[PDB]
Design an enzyme around this catalytic site. Structure first.
Site, PDB file in Angstrom:
ATOM      1  N   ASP B 150     -11.027 -48.633  -1.833  1.00  0.00           N
ATOM      2  CA  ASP B 150      -9.558 -48.762  -1.816  1.00  0.00           C
ATOM      3  C   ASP B 150      -8.973 -49.026  -3.210  1.00  0.00           C
ATOM      4  O   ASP B 150      -7.983 -48.421  -3.585  1.00  0.00           O
ATOM      5  CB  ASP B 150      -9.138 -49.893  -0.876  1.00  0.00           C
ATOM      6  CG  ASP B 150      -9.481 -49.595   0.564  1.00  0.00           C
ATOM      7  OD1 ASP B 150      -9.470 -48.411   0.956  1.00  0.00           O
ATOM      8  OD2 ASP B 150      -9.822 -50.547   1.284  1.00  0.00           O
ATOM      9  N   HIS B 177     -10.189 -53.152   5.461  1.00  0.00           N
ATOM     10  CA  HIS B 177     -10.388 -51.710   5.319  1.00  0.00           C
ATOM     11  C   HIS B 177     -10.184 -50.960   6.633  1.00  0.00           C
ATOM     12  O   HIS B 177     -11.141 -50.622   7.333  1.00  0.00           O
ATOM     13  CB  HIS B 177     -11.772 -51.371   4.724  1.00  0.00           C
ATOM     14  CG  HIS B 177     -11.902 -49.939   4.296  1.00  0.00           C
ATOM     15  ND1 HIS B 177     -11.158 -49.389   3.278  1.00  0.00           N
ATOM     16  CD2 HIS B 177     -12.590 -48.906   4.849  1.00  0.00           C
ATOM     17  CE1 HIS B 177     -11.363 -48.096   3.212  1.00  0.00           C
ATOM     18  NE2 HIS B 177     -12.234 -47.762   4.155  1.00  0.00           N
TER      19      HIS B 177
END
Lengths: 312, 312
Positions: B150, B177
């Site tokens: 990310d 996530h």
């Protein structure tokens, strides 16, 4: 610089692509091509890594879009061998793949430097040369059979034998890429000495290293990750030379003076136009002289098989 | 340092292994484990790359040999999702894999730092924590859900939007996530400013980036090469901190003060014992405050699913 990878979805192509995405100079372009429909998604995957290298992926029968404006083309498409096969046993499945892809290269980017990885390299480089000649576009300074995996294997095996740092030993390897034609020049390794038993044993280990991986994977393929590394080293050497860096030298299988065979791997000084000079193989030990003389008939049979394929 | 990779034969595991072989400090050891019988041959393949990192590969049901003396364990085993699925849809197939592997970790190397990559991370980290607690061996400073993909996705998307160098932008990402719990802190990116439309659009692109790759691969898997890169960055950060390097900070999903949820990803100062301090998330914009408040019920449901699995 733009680098095209043909065969980008295979094990070799994906490792190569990852290393090039992270290691090419800022401002570079990378295009990936395979007929496998996953290929544009391999490019989207890599495009999320924060480096200044643009990447695009292409699928289908036509590689043209991947090839437009390419300065370097790296060809890694082809089937792997299984336990009990030799590299030359791959001729039937891989010859046509190389012919097809090099025809597209000849039309779209005839001035690109071309590195052939596809097995068996001793033969597939001869196929490529004949395709380019038939197209009226062959430049012998820009066609390379990639033999770098033999170099880095030798560096590893010597350092571990001799207690050196692996990053600090470089061994010249000449000949070709097959169990009989790989000849590591252990007599020319700076700062290290070998007994005659050590020479015989190491040369064996180096020549059979590809078979050792095929055996160890047990039907799951041949060397992919180390071959990706080796090809990334060669491709980066090419890119440095094309950008004007001085004194870049690599061993590769190339058409040369014909003194041993039409194509032969030897040390090469690279420059802005492909190979700048084909350097001398230097002085050989008695072992090395004997090995070289013994390989020559096998090498020119390998070469003749590729020429036949294109020309009959 | 010894690093074990559990799940070494998959797409993620092979990319990770290649990057670690070439990038770990000299003197390091790397052990690879998967039940896939190709795994010892993946290690022989990598062992031909000339760096000072010893590598061994193991197969079969027992990971013990891979785990003996490990300082860092990176777990990337698990199935990928197909187009039209969400990450949480992987719970049925991957929960049992993580439980089994973390039991072996708990017996063999209970003092190792453990990074979980296996999807869905919001849930699988909770499974791991409960396995370790039941074994009497849980240390909350040594269990990490790896969220680094990310971060590097955000760095890429911002630099390209804002005309920066990708290597030169770092964006903090907090939460977890999953499509709802990934929260990039764009208000805290140094030297760049965004309109409210730019914030909304970027946060969308970042949250759906995993789905974009799954769609682009068309049934051929999810992100492997960029995830290998991201995990190699996290693992190298871990190794640096464990060796005594100062000021190493990474965002990861960790058990913390519970102020938002039991597990939560935030910036962490790493040291010789895992996490040294859990740093403050700082000041949030109105957009970021709203996004954080909206994700909280989904996050603690994710966490509760993992705890249930181990405890009922």
């Amino acid at each position: 610089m733009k680098v095209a990878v043909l065969g980008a979805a295979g094990g070799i192509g994906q490792a190569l692509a990852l290393l090039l995405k992270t290691q090419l100079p800022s401002g570079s372009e990378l295009s990936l091509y395979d007929i496998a429909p996953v290929t544009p998604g391999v490019a989207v995957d890599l495009s999320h890594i924060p480096t200044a290298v643009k990447i695009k992926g292409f699928s289908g029968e036509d590689a043209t879009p991947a090839l437009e404006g390419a300065d370097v083309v790296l060809i890694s498409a082809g089937v792997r061998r299984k336990p009990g096969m030799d590299r030359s046993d791959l001729f039937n499945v891989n010859a046509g793949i190389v012919k097809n892809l090099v025809q597209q290269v000849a039309k779209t980017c005839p001035k690109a430097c071309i590195g052939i990885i596809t097995n068996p390299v001793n033969t597939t480089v001869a196929i490529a040369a004949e395709v380019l000649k038939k197209a009226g576009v062959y430049d012998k300074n820009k066609l390379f059979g990639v033999t770098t995996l033999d170099i880095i294997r030798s560096n590893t095996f010597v350092a571990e034998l001799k207690g050196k740092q692996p990053g600090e030993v470089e061994v010249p390897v000449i000949g070709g890429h097959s169990g009989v034609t790989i000849l590591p020049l252990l007599s020319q390794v700076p700062g290290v000495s070998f007994t005659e038993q050590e020479v015989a044993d190491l040369t064996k280990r180096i020549q059979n290293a590809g078979t050792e991986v095929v055996e160890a994977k047990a039907g799951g393929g041949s060397a992919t990750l180390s071959m990706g590394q080796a090809a990334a080293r060669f491709g980066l050497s090419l890119v440095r030379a094309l950008q004007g860096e001085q004194g870049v030298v690599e061993c590769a299988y190339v058409e040369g003076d014909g003194q041993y065979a039409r194509f032969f791997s030897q040390p090469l000084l690279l420059g802005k136009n492909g190979v700048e000079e084909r350097k001398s193989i230097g002085t050989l030990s008695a072992f090395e002289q004997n090995a070289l003389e013994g390989m020559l008939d096998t090498l020119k049979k390998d070469i003749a098989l590729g020429q036949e394929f294109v020309n009959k």
